[PDB]
């Protein structure tokens, strides 16, 4: 019979409390585990996978053609092709990807990103593109030589078929990735003068998430 | 880097089911355990193909107006395979193998723990094939212990918490709205796009 | 060539009979004719080879089944065609029903020729939602490859046995599905071949059968 | 006088609980066991 | 030499906010967490430029007359960024990520702990610049758990205690009276002198 | 199931109780600390800083001129200039300083003090002053030779520009610091015959504080 | 000379670009004309040099900023003048609004030319309350010096980076303010200079810039 006193917090049911409960079936041993391949341990393993961005989310577009950036040959040079934001936790192209759906369950995110382009076109067709990152605080560039002074990659179709642009650091006014026709879309005869670009996006090892919250897609 | 683990992603209490009691005029109230009930935990458990976890069940029973009078209550856990109770004074309540909890309304809410009770090695909700009646998880009956019949209508809230949860074979997150409870039926017409529309492709809306 | 190992695991035996002679052969299915307005194809694997030769005979007259697979998808086109395919395996690929009914006894359900297509596969109706209400934009979480007609023409996927139970019936339970989807459509100039073939070969690596119920 | 708090699950009577009870007769020693042949330890001895 | 440390200078319970409930006719009652509420702790936390602390919140809920009847109460902590509840029976109450506390009126007062929840390294109230919506600290909703609507009006008192408090860059103590809640606006006219007047400079009044 | 008994003090909410509480967010790690310069650890670090006393707190004075002791040249000698009390926890000149505002949150104080004078005047102007401490129990001195027998410093303007008088010991009938014109305020031509003295005051390492109480400035 | 180190810490780098050549130079502001009826002056530092040369160009076209400062305040008068200045740095110096309104949408607020004065500074309206409702009698808690016109004519303050975040915008957030106040007014005989200059020089010690957004 030890003396004891009851302090405030007695007889309350805290939702997030880490307290043990009395088992209904004692001595019941469950079925032993077997080796099932593909076990996940954290959600950061789900953010580091490339995922097709829906950059063509405008109207007058069907179901699948929202995932493709069209490029044509009747398309003069030193001119813009596409542009999209970088912030994953926001309505836009980053809503169809997996890092955007995961970073909506959490209220804060930080770290670098990675945007990978892939050119679905003919083998005989070549040409260059200018992929340009503009950091937060700056508006979308209006000229190609203004974007060439920011962060840029000259990605051609002949040698490479898939370029990758790493987004240095984004906090939770977001930064703009533009994609410019630079030289042309030159094509030999008997070959279609219209191809597509699939844009994908994922996080990096620096990407960290914190302060949970129920999502709002439902 | 600790708020992103699957265990922390799933381990948190939260409403899992509302049970209405009347004690007129059925007397008792049953409830089949299923975590696919609400559309908030269904979307988090349809992200993974296989899951394995223990459960903590909390019973918060209130009255119609809100006042709590000291009446005895019996909660009864029916394991998978045992028959459900059919009446308020049936013989399924006195069965010794159905674990019961006797608690008053003025007492703190009831709290029990249920282990992994599936004959396989892990739960699964996406079963591609034909028999998924494999993971029943039990049932939870509740009645008012009394010789005669009482004249109160109660309202129980079952809050479920998951513990020691393990996940296997992740799968993408469902974007289409729900139509049924046990089937992933979407609508062929009016397919909702996964990204809100903007004006042009050359802008930053 | 680049080989994708599904979930980083090789298919192995159970730590049951082992044919090892006539079951480790390349079952080649018929070629699918990919065109401009095509949508995609999917195959259920433990019932794609249930009518073909030694594997079908040894899997219909048994009761317990456990095996991995080695998939090879060739897609041979010319140098003037363009397009892209996404080839991916999906464990427990449940075909959804397309309708607008919320009553359990009036909502539509897929038939047997849609859930279990057989050795001839089946075509998607809405490939944007994988005929499962789940978008294909994030279908890259599965073991997958891209068949880009300007880089390569073949893909290879070694997939182990993904199941919660060590043995299962090979007739009443499809283990996983293969899905080929033309994300970027097929384009060609006038005078070229208007439809290009897709060939699939299957190798049942590490097969195990049990319960010879004849 | 140690501080303490009461958590949920207080004042409940769980049927399958492995909890000790206060003995009615303390210090009462029962009759010592003798060797009775044919003791069973599990039900698997009855199925075989 | 222990009553002069900053930790002892700040660590002590004390009224931090009075919340009125009616349950007619809004049903619920929200309260945004801010320690600048009263003019007694505001003067002690405007003495320092940066602060970092955990909080202990105590909920003492009484009735209008004073008698305590055994009704269930739900307190809900809304973290910074989550939406506030809009109604008595909205879906923000059933959200699993908003930590709730279920306690009766006849029970001892409720007591919870809130950690440092700012994205910066320390709190700050004097922000010289333009965006200080950075330290929201959360919200605290409270409602009466019941199926139907009750007929009582309550009165909750939130007592806050600070713990593990660290201070940086001390600054002088404000002498002028207060005019607003979030701004250090003084009055240009009628400036109160910091020392009571005396007759002459050559005396000892 | 250990036996236990509940003693008096059960189910009470003591305000000053040092009791742990159940955390709302478990496992939530906050933002790591960085090195912010200027951390304070006790309030004795805030009392040891010199602070301008408001010795000219009389009426007919504007805002800033309440902080200055005027000294003039048309001001005969062996005569008083200023006088003020020493007790910081009392209404007067010690209410505008920081040690006085800090020692109002606490009900008892002890130890030595330090009063520092600073002469704001011309460089060519010299003269002497008599700073005189008179301990508690004595009234304000009436003559300069009566103050010269107490505690005194002869502080001249030519050599020194800032004198310091240490107050030996004060408890919580307070002691009086007087400041006397001794010789003159002699000044050459083309130089103003009017200067000021800024008085500052602080505690020492002996100063200790105890028994807290809410202030009464609000 | 006597140098006051703010809070006993030297400005150091982050444990970003480092100019080290054209940014470690003495930016000299215009001289302020101190007179008899003057009240005081204050400067906001990460926006005092946002229009001046290399530091302004490298701080307007970047996004992250972190630097300390070395302040030198000379106050050269004759030997016949008298007075005293208080020069002190204040971290997070918020300018208050002067009014007698308690309504949040009707109470006055300081404009942009009052909160952020620029390279020309701004004068106090009520220096007894530091234009912040807080008395200047206890403004000696900050790093400070006295400029007494009978002892010395110069002051020097080395101030590190005082902020809760390691990087911040140099345009939308003033880090700290400099305040010069004539506690004892200026006196002089007839025929002398009726107004004496005050000169300020600034050295951006250990500057770091990030995010070249042009």
In short:
With 205 residues, chain B is mostly beta strands.
N-end to C-end Cα span of chain A: 54 Å
For the record, the count of structural domains of chain C works out to 1
What is the tally of helical segments of chain C? 2
Distance between the termini of chain C: 43 Å
Shape of chain A: elongated
Oligomerization state: part of a larger assembly
Major sheet details of chain C: 6 strands, mixed
What is the total domain count of chain A?
Answer: 1
Protein name (chain D): Genome polyprotein
Subcellular location (chain D): Host cytoplasmic vesicle membrane; Host nucleus; Virion
Family (chain D): Belongs to the picornaviruses polyprotein family.
Organism (chain D): Coxsackievirus A10
Describe the 3D structure.
The structure is cut from a larger assembly and holds 3 copies of chain A, 2 copies of chain B (about 200 residues) and 2 copies of chain C (about 210 residues). Chain A has about 220 residues and is mainly β. Chain A has helices at about 45, 100, 145, and strands at about 1-5, 15, 20-25, 40, 70, 80-85, 105-120, 130-135, 150-155, 165-170, 175-180, 195-205, 210. Chain A has one domain. Chain A contains 3 helices and 13 strands, in the order E-E-E-E-H-E-E-H-E-E-H-E-E-E-E-E. In chain A, strands 5, 7, 10, 12 and 13 form a 5-stranded antiparallel beta sheet that branches. Chain C is mainly beta. Chain C has one domain (about 1-215). In chain C, about 5% of the residues lie in helices and about 30% in strands. Chains in contact: A-B, A-C, A-D, A-E, A-F, A-G, B-C, B-D, B-E, B-F, D-F, E-F, E-G, F-G. The interface of B and E includes residues 38, 63, 67, 106 and 155 of B.
């Amino acid at each position: 019979g030890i003396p004891a006193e009851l302090r405030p917090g007695t007889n309350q049911f805290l939702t997030t409390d880490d307290d043990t409960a009395a088992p209904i079936l004692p001595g019941f041993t469950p079925t032993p585990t077997i080796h099932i391949p593909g076990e996940v341990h954290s959600l950061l393993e789900l953010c580091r996978v490339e995922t097709i961005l829906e950059v063509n989310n405008t109207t007058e577009a069907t179901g699948l053609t929202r995932l493709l950036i069209p490029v044509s040959s009747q398309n003069k040079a030193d001119e813009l092709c596409a542009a999209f934001m970088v912030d994953p936790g926001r309505i836009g192209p980053w809503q169809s990807t997996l890092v955007g759906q995961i970073c909506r369950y959490y209220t804060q995110w930080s770290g670098s990103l990675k945007v990978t382009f892939m050119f679905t076109g003919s083998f005989m067709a070549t040409g260059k593109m200018l992929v340009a990152y503009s950091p937060p605080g700056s508006a979308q560039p209006a000229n190609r030589e203004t974007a060439m002074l920011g962060t840029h990659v000259i990605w051609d179709f002949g040698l490479q078929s898939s370029v990758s642009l790493v987004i240095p650091w984004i906090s939770n006014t977001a930064g703009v990735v533009t994609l410019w026709y630079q030289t042309n879309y030159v094509v030999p005869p008997e070959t279609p003068g219209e191809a597509y670009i699939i844009a994908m996006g994922a996080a990096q090892d620096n990407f960290t998430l914190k302060i949970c919250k129920d999502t709002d897609e439902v | 880097v600790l708020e992103t683990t699957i265990n922390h992603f799933f381990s948190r209490s939260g409403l899992v089911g509302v049970v209405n009691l009347t004690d007129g005029t059925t007397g008792y109230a049953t409830w089949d355990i299923d975590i696919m009930g609400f559309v908030q935990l269904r979307r988090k458990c349809e992200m993974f193909t296989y899951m394995r976890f223990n459960a903590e069940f909390t019973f918060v029973t209130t009255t119609k107006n809100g006042e709590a009078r000291p009446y005895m209550l019996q909660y009864m856990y029916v394991p998978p395979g045992a028959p459900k109770p059919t009446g308020r004074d049936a013989f399924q309540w006195q069965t010794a193998t159905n674990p019961s909890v006797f608690v008053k309304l003025t007492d703190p809410p009831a709290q029990v723990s249920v282990p992994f009770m599936s004959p396989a090695s892990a739960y699964q909700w996406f079963y591609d094939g034909y028999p998924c009646p494999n993971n029943m998880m039990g049932t939870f009956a509740v009645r008012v212990v009394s010789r005669e019949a009482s004249q109160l209508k109660l309202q129980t809230r079952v809050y479920m918490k998951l513990k020691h949860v393990r996940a296997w074979v992740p799968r993408p997150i469902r974007s289409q709205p729900y139509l049924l409870k046990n089937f992933p039926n979407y609508d062929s017409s009016k397919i909702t796009n996964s990204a809100r529309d903007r004006s042009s492709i050359k802008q930053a809306n | 060539a680049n080989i994708v190992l599904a979930y980083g695991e090789w298919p192995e035996y159970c730590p049951p009979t082992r044919p090892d002679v006539s079951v480790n052969r390349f079952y080649t299915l018929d070629s699918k004719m990919w065109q401009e307005n095509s949508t995609g194809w999917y195959w259920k694997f433990p019932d794609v080879l249930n009518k073909t030769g030694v594997f079908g005979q040894n899997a219909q007259f048994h009761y317990l089944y456990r095996s991995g697979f080695c998939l090879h998808v060739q897609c041979n086109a010319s140098k003037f065609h363009q397009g892209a395919l996404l080839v991916a395996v999906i464990p427990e690929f449940v075909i959804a029903g397309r309708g607008s009914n919320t009553k359990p006894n009036e909502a539509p359900h897929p038939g047997f020729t849609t859930t279990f297509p057989g050795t001839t596969g089946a075509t998607f109706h809405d490939p944007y939602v994988l005929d499962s209400g789940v978008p294909l934009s994030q279908a890259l979480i599965y073991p997958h490859q891209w068949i880009n007609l300007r880089t390569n023409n073949c893909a290879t996927v070694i997939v182990p046995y993904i199941n919660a139970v060590p043995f299962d019936s090979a007739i009443n339970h499809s283990n996983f599905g293969l899905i080929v989807i033309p994300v970027s459509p097929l384009k060609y100039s006038s005078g070229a071949t208007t439809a290009i073939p897709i060939t699939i070969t299957i190798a049942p690596l590490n097969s195990e059968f049990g319960g010879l119920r004849q």
